[PDB]
């Protein structure tokens, strides 16, 4: 009934520049909190970014100053602009949007591995 | 049968001796009392009193009990007249019964020395100084409980925890929880004292405000119990916590009158909702069949014009959409008019009941 | 003419013998009956009874028939007084006629043994146990018929057939059709028994609820007939199937009172719609001529401000557009005020008629 | 002064001879008429008539003219009583005056043989067959005139001429013009015959419906005159053509009653508009000063929240914008409540005046 | 006790001599006055006067002071009757007291020759010609003050100065300032003369319209003082300048009646706002919990459905959003109905108070 | 009064990639069901795709996984993205939008033949 | 207060293809009729096209089938697509929008002359 | 809480052509007056342009006819189109939006120096 599809993946070399996108239908993002989560090989998922509804953006220590998460608030679209990618980034990424206490929804995954 | 002539201020009223002896303990019937007023010179009992009243006090003797006030004698002059004639307290209550005035003031204080004293402290707030202090404290506790129910569900405080669920805690770190537990502590203590100090424990599960206290206590206990012991019950229990707003009716005489008005008028509210359902079916069907052909119209079902039909008739007005055909516009103006026509019909009964229960406090 | 003095409780009322003999079968006129009360000692007929009433019972004798209750004698004390005086049932119905109380209870059961027994079963639901069972079954059948009319036109079930037309079927595969045929079977059987067991077959096409049954049966039969035997009739026939909501009025006493209220108040509803049409022409013309010059305004016709004028006056409020000029805003505030002023004028007549027909059941 | 004792049904009423001779032409005063009822045996005038009425007919003699009906005697029994006593037509009109009933039916037909006959044909439509024919023709002509005023300003017919102005024509090619001239021909002929056949030519410019006919004729003549003989007058003249809707009031008795109601209630309408202006200034100022700081708010002036304040108080509701601050929301809920509170206050006076003028036709 | 028989028109009323001597200065009590009416032939005092009234004038003697009008005697005939009997002005005021009619007309002109003459000029505008001139000038000054308050905050005139702040001036270049100072000059002069010419300087700070004059003068003086001598006070002072609209109540008798109505009905307005707050909490909570699950819904808090709940119940209707679930739609139709049900309940009390104070001017 | 105009046709070779478009005026597609129909030479029309109002997409067996029908729900536009075209596709195509029980509207036709 | 500005002019040769534009502010075109007028040197203005509000387009005989007038109904813009320009076209063009009986507004002019 | 960010700066030579942009969030520009201010080295800021809400544009003497200030009234964006830049222009620029009597907000600055 609802779906979270994403693109922009692949492989990159050192000092790259890329932009994954997450889009959905059955769920206006204008009304729900959202973020991008990554899962390095060998440990559990960590968070790249969070844009709680209302324009409050917070990022984890690893991606600070190299990453931006924006909701075009149009076309039910959230876009992440990653920058100067480093080999520690190598991972599989996932997208999400949820209301605390009621529902949680995920994407299928789309990976970016840095050479 | 011998006849007796009573002259109230020049107006001669006559009756058979049997009629005024039917009730023998009364002033006219008792031979000795009546003997004082008797004048032997003209064989008549002269009294100086209101003329329009003594007519009704002879009907009571001749009709075996009926007491009805003439419509041109004011209440006070009549109440005094039954007293001079000595018709008895049974008679004066019946007169109050015919003017329909509430006569019930049954307050059975237990009179066991301590149970009665603390019951006077906790039930009747006008009695003392600490009674009004306890009333003021209870109203302020209820108010901050409502403020916690609404500010808890606000999102600005949860932004330290706004995270996906896949990653009522007794950790005592959440301030809403500890102030909530203080409110439920006060409600529980107050209810248990009103249980153990009441003069009638059999009737305590009959008064509706007591059942409001119980159903306001309940959901915090069952969520604490099941947490330190479901997913269907949790969304219902989170909305049975809204009844603490009705627990503010013990301290208001306007909410209690709205409860009496809404109890004594249920047939009218049933007629209101029934008329609304009839009109919603009729007008939503007519606008669906008068606008479906247009390729730019938006009504795609009969159970899709229902919201449009309710908002147009009540006058909120937003609509899901709005008619775009000449035919939809004719069925939308008739809908707007028939709405106020069919909802203004049962309402004067409800406002008349409110006005009656609102002045009966006086 | 000899004179007769009647003394009702000390109050002497006198009249000519001719006046009380006009009606000879009555208590005062009949020589023998009146002879009992007569007292030969003072030549007066002493009675002990209410004083304010015996005045009206002498007017009836002196006015050839008029019977009017004094406004200070309660109904019960008067009804009893006509009985003691023996004025006759013709007199007491006239008193009921002057208090205007409905007096018609004509229920001609046929009394042919079986026609009468099944008529008692099917018409008066309070009579038995199976009568209330039949009432409950009929109300549930009507309710599921309404649910099929609305869920049939929903689109979620038709998505196996949502295809362009260029590529009521008796295939019995569509579940809506077979449950619809079961409902029309029940309506037909019930109507035919109420026809053949009625005690008056000439009056059966006069009662309005019977004509509601017939026009609820009709369109399914004519669509079945023409299907197994048009494109203008089909959109009308699909909306004459909405009258099964009015066939729920035989089992409600609130819908029947709204039908009496809307029949007895047609002049007021005509005045309501007439005043609305006047105001719509006047205000839509004034807003078109006070906003046409502005290049950013949207009123392009006088028959284009009509919807804006109806929604502003009734208060639904949406409007097709909204004034953008200072002049459009002055003609839009006057329109808002004059709307409630001209629609609140004929409504108290309608609510007074409803209130009368609503308490006349009592 | 000698005394006279009149006994109406056992009730002895007594007065000085001088009082009943004040009015000498009346039944009691005239010595001969009163002599018939006199009984020489007991020196009293026995009459058999209603007791509660003869009290008021002695006040008229003792009070020099006042005639007031007791509140417990019905109108019919009193009207008859003044007739038997022979109090005169001046007296019965005063009784009608005290029950306040309209008494004016002044219809001065000229009686000059032809002027009277055609005046009967054209003024009173119930008189004949052709009178109702003339009423039906006049109503249909007025209706098609309204239809031409609205369909003329529609744009679909002008699309053969929808071209820039830089590139009421008597070319007789425009069909709206020739049907408009036929309507004004009928109005002119009908008005000129009602002028020349009236029985009072001095009062003809006093009746308001005649001045409605004149101001409905006027603008077509002045535009024809100036066309075959300005740009400020043209937009006013195009809106004085809307008064042909009020010329439909000669043939309706509901529009005439709304005209009487709106004339006799101008102080209340002035109070309505005054209270609205006060509330609009107060609430628009408070919402402008409680929402100006927010950078995303839209109120940029105090004369920019005026429309928002009128639509919220009357309840149409659209608003130019909507509050976005907590403070704007508190001044917007108070505005919504105070609106219905301050517009429901003068309205019961207006509906009571309408109800009075609406039942006075009966 | 000797007895006295008074015969008012054939009706014999009798009483003990002591009762009519309780009040000795009155007509019946004074031996000499009563002696005129006495007739020695039959030992009765014949009077020719209304029968229904003399009954109430004997109750006053027998009840020590009570004076109550029978409900079937019109006011004028009674007022005259207390005068003939000579019951005294204390008695007639008590009769006026029982019909509850306002009796206060206390206008203490100082009578010091000049203070009284100019007080007559400035207070009572109907007295002279210049008094109406002064009333007309004061109303026009108040009107142009309101026009300056609104046109000052308009932005079209400030566009010579619409520049960022980082780059009430006594430069006398701003025209709004000099016309504002002229208005405050007129208000100050008029208030100071009404102070120094009043006949009661102690009561001058008690009348509410005087305190309206003072709080209309205040903010211009404190902003001039602090300017030629804060940022929290400036936004409050700019909204206390809106009270010059209430200074227009000295010259209107409709605003003064709305002030009396809103003072005498504060319990009802408190009940109105209390019922609204209850309904807003209840319905906003139910719509938040019946629409939160849907991913496309917009209610994100319970203190975010509050505006939606106020506009749906009052019927303005816009809403912040609109329900999109079947459950939100059922809690939105109940909200629309319960709104008018709970706000129409205390309003008839307020309109009845207005109607009373509105006709008491007559 | 209403019209359904379409473009994007021509001829293609094996393994092509193309996108026809259908646009209309006098008929918001936001409110009506729509689909693309093709007519091979020699037999009657068959269906390429259907997007019943409400986002329920169904395709016939021949075009499964090679075709997508989307309503931009903006500009009253329905677009079909055909992919890897095969010679069996050779045909003339048509567009439509209808309400069951009330009205049916067609396009003029625009052909795509695969070499 | 209102203005009608236009672009796209110049000179063209035989068989050209061009598109003038008319834009305005102080006047939504969504609500008013509009057209393009040209003035050949030596005679008075004739009409190239008219789009009466409501989408009814009519053209004069000279430009039939070579010209299209469209209101993007967005951005208060009316665009004319002229095609296969011929030397008889040589002229100065003007834009307009009016309400019959109330107001008439013009553009400044912008010329297209065909070689 | 509110911010005014701007771009388009750098250095230019004689006769250049450039366009700075100012965007914001927490402040719809549809509802507030706005302008661009520059600060030459050595004296206080002077004004390049002002667009008071309602489309009333005024410019200072130095930039007349070489500068345009426009609010796309979309995307909360005000754009200045500078033209034929001259060496006297050398300066640091700033953006602003304010309501007289209530609030005043500034940008961080973005410079354009002409060679
Ligand atoms: K409303
Ligand atoms: K509304
Ligand atoms: K609305």
Author numbering:
A (entry chain H), F (entry chain E), G (entry chain F), H (entry chain G): 2 to 116
B (entry chain A), C (entry chain B), D (entry chain C), E (entry chain D): 103 to 269, 287 to 348, 359 to 491
Reproduce, without paraphrasing, sentences from the article in which this PDB structure was first reported:
Next, we solve the structure of Kv1.3 with the recently-developed nanobody inhibitor A0194009G09 (Ablynx/Sanofi) which inhibits with nanomolar affinity through an unknown mechanism and has 1,000-fold selectivity for Kv1.3 over hERG, Kv1.5, and Kv1.643. To solve the structure of Kv1.3 with the NB inhibitor the proteins were combined in a 3:1 molar ratio (3 NB per Kv1.3 subunit) and imaged by single particle cryo-EM. The data was initially processed with C1 symmetry and four copies of the NB were observed on the extracellular surface of Kv1.3. This result supported the use of C4 symmetry to process the data and a density map was refined to 3.25 Å resolution followed by model building. The nanobodies do not make direct contact with the selectivity filter of Kv1.3, but rather they decorate the turret loops near the pore and extend contacts to the VSDs. On the turret loop, Phe103 of the NB forms a hydrophobic interaction with Ala421, Arg100 forms a hydrogen bond with Ser426, and Tyr104 and Pro424 make hydrophobic contact. Arg51 and Asn59 of the NB both appear capable of hydrogen bonding with Tyr265 on the VSD, while Trp99 of the NB forms a hydrophobic interaction with Pro266. In the pore region of the NB-bound structure Asp449 is flipped away from Trp436 in an orientation incompatible with hydrogen bond formation. However, Tyr447 adopts two different rotamers in the density map. One Tyr447 rotamer is similar to the D1 conformation of unbound Kv1.3, with its hydroxyl group directed towards Thr441.
